[PDB]
Design a protein around this ligand. Structure first.
Ligand SMILES: [Ca+2]
Length: 636
């Protein structure tokens, strides 16, 4: 009967902030061999997308590769597919930024000798209004998953054709990635794809099956290089796929030049299926996984998958407050910097998606990806005149206080212990509080014993200047892990405040609960200094009681494999060369200092990830009725 049309595509992306060797390995393990083997089969057509940073790393290091890509473009073997230059999730960035981001990559594709008409949707996060944006960028089609169509209401059998979708009276074509093909290519034996595709043929000559996935699958992921190249899966596939008379190879643009989309369809906010799991808060994700697994155990997943639903990507901002804070801070700067091309480039770089969420790849859990985002938010903001302001930054209904001078930007949350949640250095372009609290992930609970004994989950968010109250006999380990007895209620409770020149005055009428409620009061005077900040404390208990007042300061120390340690100190220094650099904490009175790394257990593509997201430093001072001291943070 009719031949089945087949579209083959890959997506190559490397996030800003990745280690140098990671790009190098991805190139020698996948980007290069894949294209070298592609050149051996003149009839093979591939639809490829390269993220901007990747193309820049390649220009600087592997120039010859680009001539190879130009050559393959010229012989009709490659269609260049674009997206936002720095791989941002389009739906999560200002519409104005979407245009500039896409146009930057279209300019690059143009330099390779191709007029890009298609967009690879980053993390396939779809929102109806993206039609307007893509259309203004001159994009005629976007790639999405078959799952998006199933969520709209269509069955898999009507997903072997692209469709139109509209919004604002504007339309754009949409191609669905066949989930089956993602399963088959390239990990299942070659003949399995040939068999699956041959079975799709019909009397409709426009029918088409689409495969589009991570290029990293062809060499980078563990065990794939041996499978794809050493054992020859790719050469065997290119040979079979270009010989089969029932399978017609073509690029997206080629398909559209010969067949018109099947019809009109509307899509919901969705992503590829796997994202439904991760984008859910921990507790629900576990349930979701249970449901999905219990559907396969009862062999009824296939006929009922079209009705399974989970979370949406944007809710990572709910799951991870730190990501939300980071995101809203960048939206804030993007707007204020929109008219300054130089400053704006930094904010566009900050929109690289990877550090804002967590699925299987570390993402937000990788400190180096996170500091890169902050680094860029800070550099973009440094162009603005410093100004103090009170406003709800992360939209939780409780205004933040932003104090700033020529060298720093501090964000205080009165509602949460009157602590500093952001201490950004304009000189180092780092956020000293670029840390993450320890949380349970639905995939926890197999974890080895060594890591198990070090696992602990926080109940407190982690910031700078968090006021504690503990028993004199309390131990570090108890505190290190989350066992210790917290006597005060000032860590996660609101404080009143008063604005003062160069700072803020906060105080809280709380209490010290032990055997009875001993009402207490905490007063803290925080002022910005040219090299950090100074905080003057005054703790007062209504009635005598022997305890230890503690001021905790969390820091994004990342290159200092620190370990539990306690010592007496009036002043101490921290040296984190690859992280926050050098800083010094000065007290006007010796204190007991407890120090411990904030350890997180994370899921990755290559085993567990037990990462130090920072180090907690908490100065203890004995108190019975009255207490007074000063803590000064100094940037060196
Ligand atoms: Ca708020």
């Amino acid at each position: 009967m009719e031949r089945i049309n087949f579209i083959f595509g890959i997506h190559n992306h490397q996030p800003l902030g990745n280690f140098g060797w990671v790009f190098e390995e991805a190139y020698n393990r996948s980007y290069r061999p894949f294209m070298e083997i592609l050149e051996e089969f003149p009839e093979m057509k591939v639809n490829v997308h390269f993220s901007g940073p990747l193309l820049e790393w390649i220009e600087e290091n592997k120039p010859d590769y680009l001539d190879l890509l130009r050559s393959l473009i010229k012989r009709g073997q490659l269609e260049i597919v674009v997206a936002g230059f720095y791989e941002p999730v389009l739906a999560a960035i200002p519409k104005e930024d979407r245009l500039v981001q896409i146009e930057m990559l279209k300019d690059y594709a143009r330099k390779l000798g191709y007029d890009a008409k298609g967009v690879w949707l980053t993390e396939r996060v779809w929102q109806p209004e993206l039609v307007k944006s893509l259309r203004e960028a001159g994009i005629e089609y976007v790639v999405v998953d078959d799952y998006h169509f199933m969520s709209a209401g269509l069955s898999k059998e009507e997903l072997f054709w692209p469709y139109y979708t509209e919004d604002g009276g504007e339309v754009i074509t949409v191609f669905p990635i066949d989930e089956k093909l993602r399963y088959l290519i390239p990990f299942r034996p070659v003949k399995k794809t040939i068999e699956y595709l041959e079975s799709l043929t019909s009397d409709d000559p426009s029918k088409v099956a689409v495969f589009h996935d991570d290029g990293e699958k062809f060499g980078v992921w563990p065990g794939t290089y041996e499978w794809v190249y050493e054992k020859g899966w790719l050469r065997e596939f290119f040979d079979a796929i270009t010989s089969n008379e029932k399978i017609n190879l073509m690029t997206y643009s080629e398909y559209l030049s010969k067949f018109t989309p099947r019809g009109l369809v509307y899509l919901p906010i969705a992503s590829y299926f796997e994202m439904s799991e991760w984008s859910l808060p921990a507790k629900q994700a576990k349930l979701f996984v249970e449901f999905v697994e219990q559907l396969k155990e009862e062999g009824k997943f296939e006929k009922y998958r079209v009705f399974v639903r989970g979370g949406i990507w944007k809710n990572f901002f709910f799951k991870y407050p730190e990501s939300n804070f980071m995101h809203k801070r960048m939206l804030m700067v993007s707007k204020a910097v929109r008219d300054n091309p130089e400053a704006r480039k930094y904010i566009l770089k900050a929109q690289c998606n990877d550090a804002y969420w967590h699925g299987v790849f570390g993402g937000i859990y990788l400190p180096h990806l996170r500091r890169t985002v902050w680094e860029n938010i800070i550099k973009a903001q440094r162009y603005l005149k410093p100004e103090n302001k009170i406003l709800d930054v992360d939209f939780d209904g409780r205004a933040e206080i932003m104090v700033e001078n020529d060298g720093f930007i501090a964000t205080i949350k009165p509602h949460y212990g009157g602590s500093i949640f952001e201490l950004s250095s304009k000189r180092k372009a780092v956020n000293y509080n670029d840390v993450l609290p320890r949380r349970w992930e639905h995939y926890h609970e197999q974890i080895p014993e060594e890591i198990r004994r070090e696992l602990a989950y926080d109940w407190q968010l982690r910031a700078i200047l968090q006021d504690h109250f503990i028993k004199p006999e309390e131990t570090l380990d108890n505190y290190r892990l989350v066992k210790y007895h917290e006597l005060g209620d000032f860590v996660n409770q609101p404080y009143e405040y008063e604005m003062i020149e160069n700072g803020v005055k906060l105080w809280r009428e709380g209490g010290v609960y032990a055997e009875e409620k001993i009402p207490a009061r905490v007063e803290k005077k925080i002022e910005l200094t040219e090299d950090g900040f100074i905080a003057k404390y005054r703790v007062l208990l209504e009635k005598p009681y022997k305890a230890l007042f503690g001021v905790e300061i969390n820091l994004a120390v990342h290159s200092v494999m620190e370990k539990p340690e306690e010592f007496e100190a009036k002043e101490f220094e921290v040296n984190d060369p690859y992280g926050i650099g050098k800083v010094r904490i000065e007290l006007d009175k010796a204190a007991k200092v407890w120090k411990f790394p904030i350890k997180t257990l994370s899921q990755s593509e290559a085993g567990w990830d037990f990462i130090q997201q920072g180090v907690s430093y908490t100065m203890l001072f004995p108190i019975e009725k009255e207490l007074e001291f000063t803590v000064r943070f100094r940037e060196l």
